[PDB]
Symmetry: C3
Subunit: 157 residues, 3 copies
Amino acid sequence: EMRIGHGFDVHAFGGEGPIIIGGVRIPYEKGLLAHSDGDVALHALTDALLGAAALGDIGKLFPDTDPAFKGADSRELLREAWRRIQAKGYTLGNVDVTIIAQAPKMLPHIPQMRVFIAEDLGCHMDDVNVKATTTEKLGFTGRGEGIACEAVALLIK
Amino acid sequence: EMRIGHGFDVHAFGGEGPIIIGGVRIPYEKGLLAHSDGDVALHALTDALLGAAALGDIGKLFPDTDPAFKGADSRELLREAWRRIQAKGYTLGNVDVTIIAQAPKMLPHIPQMRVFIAEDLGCHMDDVNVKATTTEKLGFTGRGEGIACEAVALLIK
Amino acid sequence: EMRIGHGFDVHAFGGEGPIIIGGVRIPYEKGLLAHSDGDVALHALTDALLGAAALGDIGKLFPDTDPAFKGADSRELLREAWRRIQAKGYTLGNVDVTIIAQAPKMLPHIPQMRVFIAEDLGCHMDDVNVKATTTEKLGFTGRGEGIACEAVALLIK
Ligand SMILES: CC(C)=CCC/C(C)=C/COP(=O)(O)OP(=O)(O)O
Ligand SMILES: Nc1ccn(C[C@H](CO)OCP(=O)(O)O)c(=O)n1
Ligand SMILES: Nc1ccn(C[C@H](CO)OCP(=O)(O)O)c(=O)n1
Ligand SMILES: Nc1ccn(C[C@H](CO)OCP(=O)(O)O)c(=O)n1
Ligand code: NA
Ligand code: NA
Ligand code: NA
Ligand code: NA
Ligand code: NA
Ligand code: NA
Ligand SMILES: [Zn+2]
Ligand SMILES: [Zn+2]
Ligand SMILES: [Zn+2]
């Protein structure tokens, strides 16, 4: 039994940097409006992992309106979701994340993102891929209004 | 042999509600312009299933311009595509769907979506995940101009 | 060991046609601004293949700012990436690509795209799916400002 999962998240720019993406603190000239980290890459990833296990998603698992969690960085949410996710018998296959942003430049940060993720999920660095791409100045992402990430996850049970 | 598939669909808001998403009748203040249901979640899913079997997509399989089908709800299209899809030897792995909409709220409807889908594909409820996410007021989806869904499917042959 | 991968690319319309998509020369009234082919479908696909192998992405592998490659069509980049990708022990599972464009019409070109891809990756035509979809006149893609593609890839090691 192998299980595929998809996640997608978005945040708007606002206030002052830096931002956190994939756990890394990246300097930039806005920060991200969010009730949390606003770490889009770990949000999308967490959702791909939950979706592959059919556990729903962050929003279900962790209500903005709910307890225990409202004081939360996205790396604890990820580690919590994974903790549930193994409790149903699952194990990691691989994981591939696509950050979609006009800036800032993600590339140099991209190794450190992967050690955070690989550590949080207990796997090897090489079950984790991350890339970033622009939308060439089209779209809300191209106008620098915010930042999207998609992710995919393969779980083995 | 395992086979991965991706689908993506979009519809514009217009006219009066409710909408159908994932087979469920959801009350809302616009409805969806479409030559059909305008059920974005079953359209994207159907495409992820067809793509994983390399059968193309709805638009190929069922021309807006073509017969037998023009009088069609998206749940029959899904069941037809699946019917083809098993005829080439395939069997269901799992399926994860991401509705992207500012409103309405999908969450409460999300169990019933899954019994429709699981039934239509003949699997267990737990080979089916559905989530919805906002784009935080950016984008055509954030401006409430319409509604996008992505889906992924794993088939076993 | 099976490995899943995701890619996403975008290009803006500008200048005179035709465009190249999936290797095919498609007549149209704008062409695509790009430092290269501007073939969005092979870019997204190449990234899904690289991501599944955890090799990063085109942009890493082939700097716009870097050598050996600046004189490059997207079909050589694809064949190069695949060439790396097998060097780490990987083999093709399947591949499903979703072109997102208001025009031109991709459908008639879609067989020939698949023989290019299948050939470039050395597989059968039927490990390759391609579809195109519109965003119903919403979005930068619906306003005909440019052209997006997503892709997913399954690799066997
Ligand atoms: C999976 C994804 C990210 C698909 C395409 C994204 C898309 C068309 C986003 C909205 O663009 P937009 O916000 O430019 O529309 P608007 O023109 O209103 O800014
Ligand atoms: N926000 C972003 C978007 C893309 N990238 C990677 C990409 C280089 O890999 O930037 C170079 P590009 O301008 O050629 O896309 C990046 O590192 N950060
Ligand atoms: N249209 C949508 C969009 C998102 N959701 C789920 C999400 C709660 O899970 O809504 C809460 P959010 O406002 O915190 O995103 C939803 O249920 N319906
Ligand atoms: N640019 C595009 C977008 C979609 N398609 C396929 C689709 C028919 O399959 O066009 C018909 P549609 O207008 O019903 O979507 C296409 O062939 N080219
Ligand atoms: Na979110
Ligand atoms: Na949040
Ligand atoms: Na459609
Ligand atoms: Na339709
Ligand atoms: Na690009
Ligand atoms: Na390019
Ligand atoms: Zn988020
Ligand atoms: Zn549709
Ligand atoms: Zn490109």
